[PDB]
Structure 1
Amino acid sequence: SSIPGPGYCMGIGPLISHGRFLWMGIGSACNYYNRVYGEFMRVWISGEETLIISKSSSMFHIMKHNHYSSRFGSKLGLQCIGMHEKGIIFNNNPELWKTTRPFFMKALSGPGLVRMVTVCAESLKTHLDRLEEVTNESGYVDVLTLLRRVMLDTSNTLFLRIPLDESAIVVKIQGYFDAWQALLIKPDIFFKISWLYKKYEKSVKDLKDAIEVLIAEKRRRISTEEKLEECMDFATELILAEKRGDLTRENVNQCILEMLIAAPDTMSVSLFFMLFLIAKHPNVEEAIIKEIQTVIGERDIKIDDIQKLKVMENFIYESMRYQPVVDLVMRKALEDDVIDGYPVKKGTNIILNIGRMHRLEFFPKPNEFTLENFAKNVPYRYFQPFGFGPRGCAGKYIAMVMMKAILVTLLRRFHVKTLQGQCVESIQKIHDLSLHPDETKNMLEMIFTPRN
């Protein structure tokens, strides 16, 4: 089979599609092209031919095989944000990625995943006792900020544990994300005219500098620690690997940064959507509350509780399926292969449109929010909210633990109301690198009214 997609108009084809991506945003442009042309089609970002695919079969092939364990993006953009061959998220050097990923995998499972359930609860409790920090005169709670702050506090106390300015770092993380999202697929031309990006450059330096202060302190405490065996964590593991000859300092620093931003970026927006859904689906909210009473009562949340929270689990899955944040995955072909019917040359970029996939393929009622979509065991080859395989989400398991933990301890204590008519469907959204609320609009607040 040949490859569907717009015509290469002697070098105008590329310029339209790239422009379309820049104007529309990666996400929406992906949905546009899959709607016009097939569920498997071809576009250009910069020079490179880039496939946009929503086919579950293609999805599965790509995530399963080692020769797609790469992403893509502007080299200049990635260098600017410090992710060019440095972190893991957008580290596209196969060997450097291969040797960095293990550090993330260790910290995000085993004992750390067990600690996380209780660390999460405490962090949320502490902030729910400080609602004055985030609540309006008319009782409007800034949930986005609240969530980001606990997500950061959580990540810090688990992976780095150095005291920090919660509120400041949160704003800086938001700054970093904009830069990341802004520069990821800008053409090289863009980077020539400098009063066009120095904006983003300063956001990166803001966060990076702020984190250096923290890593610097972490280095001191380690160099004077008596029971070094007793108190291992993610940052320490990296620093020791660096003091063998295994890692670069630049690399260590980017890793710590990537580990700190991950949950604030994705978990908080995810939980936010989840909370709005709860507010608009009383039936579902009752099921959850009943399950909590049955399983937990008023005991503190514990690791052994999490498997038992079946209703919630399905709620989280359905929320993610219906209202994704991470609706698209960027990959690159490292070897030549034939995928379904189509030839895929090495160096070909790939965007997997998992959000659209979850609305076309397996589910009984794709275009409406129901736990019915999860009434029967769903094969992981038709539902990929995290990705799987050698480069699937590093936090895929701990994420489920965290989301359960915070959903439990929040709803346990508060009923959540939405302002006016507002629901996830009516929220104005940016659909670019991820799918999130446009925060230049308003009516994004909620009302937290007590229980009992």
Structure 2
Amino acid sequence: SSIPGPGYCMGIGPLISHGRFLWMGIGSACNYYNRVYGEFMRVWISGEETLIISKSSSMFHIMKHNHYSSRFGSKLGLQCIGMHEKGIIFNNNPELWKTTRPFFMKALSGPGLVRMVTVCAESLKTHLDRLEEVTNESGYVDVLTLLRRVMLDTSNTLFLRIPLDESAIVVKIQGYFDAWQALLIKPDIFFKISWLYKKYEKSVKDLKDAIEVLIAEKRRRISTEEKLEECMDFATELILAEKRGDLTRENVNQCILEMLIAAPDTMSVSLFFMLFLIAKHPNVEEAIIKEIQTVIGERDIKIDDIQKLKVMENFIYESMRYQPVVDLVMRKALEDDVIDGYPVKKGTNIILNIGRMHRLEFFPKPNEFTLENFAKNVPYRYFQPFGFGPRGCAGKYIAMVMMKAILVTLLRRFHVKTLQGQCVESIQKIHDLSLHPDETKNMLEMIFTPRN
């Protein structure tokens, strides 16, 4: 059927689109091009032809099949952040990825998913008893920081459990995410002029070194153990795999790093948007509070509760649909294939614009926030907040458990208020690697007034 998109200008076509991605940010540029040209179109990042697609049918084909189980990005950028053929997130070596993923899949389901519900609640409780760490003179809570701090504490106590400087690591993680987002699609030219990136190089060293201290301690505790099998975790599994010849030390270290940053990166921003939505939708917030009374009372949250929290589940789904954070997914074609009548050569980059997809396709009221969008069972071939298939979000199930547990134990205790007019729509956003608040602006704080 041939491929819609801007003209190749004897080598200038590519330069404009790349430059546009650099100026605009990956997210907004994807939205720009899907709006101007079709919902399935072609662009260039560096040399490579890269398709940006919002069509749900294309989405489904791509995530369903093994020959798309890869992402893309600057080799120089990925090596720089330590994700070139090393973690899982942007590990683009198919075999190395294939054998690393199982470790993440195991730690993020089964017994660990069950522990996580209570670990989360206890972590948030402990931090809500310490609001003095995060509250203003005028009573303003820095929710973003609060959330990141518990999200890290959660991840640590589950996957690594080694005592750490919470506040410091949180800042370093933000530093890391920046470098990652900055360098991911910079052209090779950029990496020549060195005073243009050593800024980021230092953020990566900051976190990596901080995590080595932690892994080093974890190695010692493991080497002298009252028999291991009585307390396995994600970090130990990796280290034992490395003592068999299955894993590389560097690779082990990147995995632990990726496991620690994941929730602080995505969950906190997600829950923040969720909290602002609750503040602005009193009717929805009452439904949730009533559901909590009916299902939980004043008991501690337990695993058997989470299925029963139907209203909240819908809230989480709608929040994510309406105000996403991870609104785009990056892939690469590993074999040739024809998809929706379009020829897709192997080596072709893909960006699935799931945020735009969720506004064009299935839902009754796409462009407004309502639980009405989830009054009837949503097919999942029209709603992919996490992705599905051989490379879908590794933490897709545990994420819903964590989001429920923290939302429950927060709202259970506090009413949340927004400052001035502020709502998710009025928040100034950066739309690049993910969709998140521009933190150089202000009025991002909240007021946590008690209940009863």
List structure 1 runs of 4+ shifted beyond 4 angstroms. Answer: none
Give me the whole-angstrom Cα distance separating, in 1, the residues matched to 2:65 and 2:3. 22
**TM-score, normalised with respect to structure 2:** 1.00
% same residue? 100
Partner of 2:319: 319
Partner secondary structure for residue 449 of structure 1: strand
User: Take 2:322 and 2:229, find their aligned partners in 1: how far apart are those partners?
Assistant: 44
Unaligned runs of 5+ in 1: none
Map Cα deviations across residues 334-371 of structure 1 (whole Å, 9 max, x no partner): 00000001000000000000000000000000000000
Task: Report whether the alignment pairs 1:58 with 2:93.
Answer: no
Distance between the aligned counterparts of 1:128 and 1:79, measured in 2? 39
1:201-260 residue CA offsets vs partner (Å, 9 max, x unmatched): 000000000000000000000000012110000000000000000000000000000000
Listed one character per residue, the Cα deviations across residues 401-444 of structure 1 (whole Å, up to 9, x for unaligned) are 00000000000000000000000000000000000000000000
Give secondary structure in 1 for the equivalent of 2:416. strand
Task: Give per-residue Cα distances to partners, 1:51-87, cap 9 Å, x unaligned.
Answer: 0000000000000000000000000000000000000
Q: Give distance in 2, aligned partners of 1:276 and 1:380.
A: 26
CA distance in 1, matches of 2:3, 2:443: 44
Alignment partners' CA distance in 2, 1:446 and 1:293: 24
Distance 1:161 1:353 in 2: 36
Equivalent position SS for 2:360: coil
Aligned-pair CA distance for 1:324? 0.1
- For 2:431 and 2:341, locate their aligned partners in 1 and report how far apart those are by CA, in whole Å: 30
1:387 positional shift? 0.1
Whole-angstrom distance in 2 between the partners of 1:372 and 1:230: 47
| C-alpha distance in 2 between matches for 1:419 and 1:208 | 36
The answer on 1:200 being equivalent to 2:196 is: no
Deviations 1:255-281 (A, max 9, x none): 000000000000000000000000000
How far apart are the structure 2 equivalents of 1:171 and 1:80? 19
Is 197-206 or 222-231 further displaced after alignment? 222-231
Whole-Å Cα distance in 1 between the matches of residues 226 and 31 of structure 2? 55
TM-score normalized with structure 1 length: 1.00
CA distance in 1 between partners of 2:252 and 2:389 (Å): 24
Q: Match of 1:326, SS?
A: coil
Could you list the per-position Cα deviations for residues 266-298 of structure 1 after superposition, in whole angstroms to 9, with x for gaps in the alignment? 000000000000000000000000000000000
User: Could you say what the CA RMSD is over the residues aligned between the two structures, in angstroms?
Assistant: 0.2
Secondary structure at the aligned position of 2:228 is classed as coil
Cα distance in 1 for partners of 2:229, 2:376 equals 45
* Secondary structure of 1:229's aligned partner: helix
1:359 match: secondary structure: helix
Give secondary structure in 2 for the equivalent of 1:367: coil
Q: Distance in 2 between matches of 1:396 and 1:417?
A: 29
Distance in 2, matches of 1:44 and 1:424, equals 32
Residue number in structure 2 paired with 1:97: 97
Report the Cα distance in structure 1 between the residues aligned to 2:301 and 2:226, rounded to whole angstroms: 33
**3-state SS of paired residue (2:351):** strand
Gaps of 5+ in 2: none
Equivalent residue, structure 2, for 1:375: 375
Q: Tell me the alpha carbon deviations over residues 187-214 of structure 1, each in whole angstroms, 9 at most, x when there is no partner.
A: 0000000000000000000000000000
Are 2:8 and 1:8 equivalent residues in the alignment? yes
Query: Separation in 2 of the partners of 1:91 and 1:401?
Result: 26
Shift of the alpha carbon at 1:390? Answer: 0.1
CA shift, 1:327, in A, is 0.0
SS in 2 for 1:416: strand
| SS of corresponding position for 1:164 | coil
Where 1:263 maps in the other structure, the secondary structure is helix
Partner residue, 1:110:
110
Find the aligned partners of 2:229 and 2:154 in 1 and give their Cα distance.
22
User: What's the CA shift string for 1:8-49, capped at 9, x where partnerless?
Assistant: 000000000000000000000000000000000000000000
What is the DSSP-based 3-state SS (H/G/I as helix, E as strand, rest coil) of the residue aligned with 1:350? strand
2:274, 2:380 → 1: CA distance? 21
Measure the CA separation in 2 of the matches of 1:15 and 1:173: 32
Q: Name the structure 2 match of 1:256.
A: 256
Distance 1:255 1:278 in 2: 34
Aligned equivalents of 1:42 and 1:50: distance in 2? 6
Per-residue deviation, 1:381: 0.1
* CA distance in 2: counterparts of 1:259 and 1:450, whole angstroms: 33
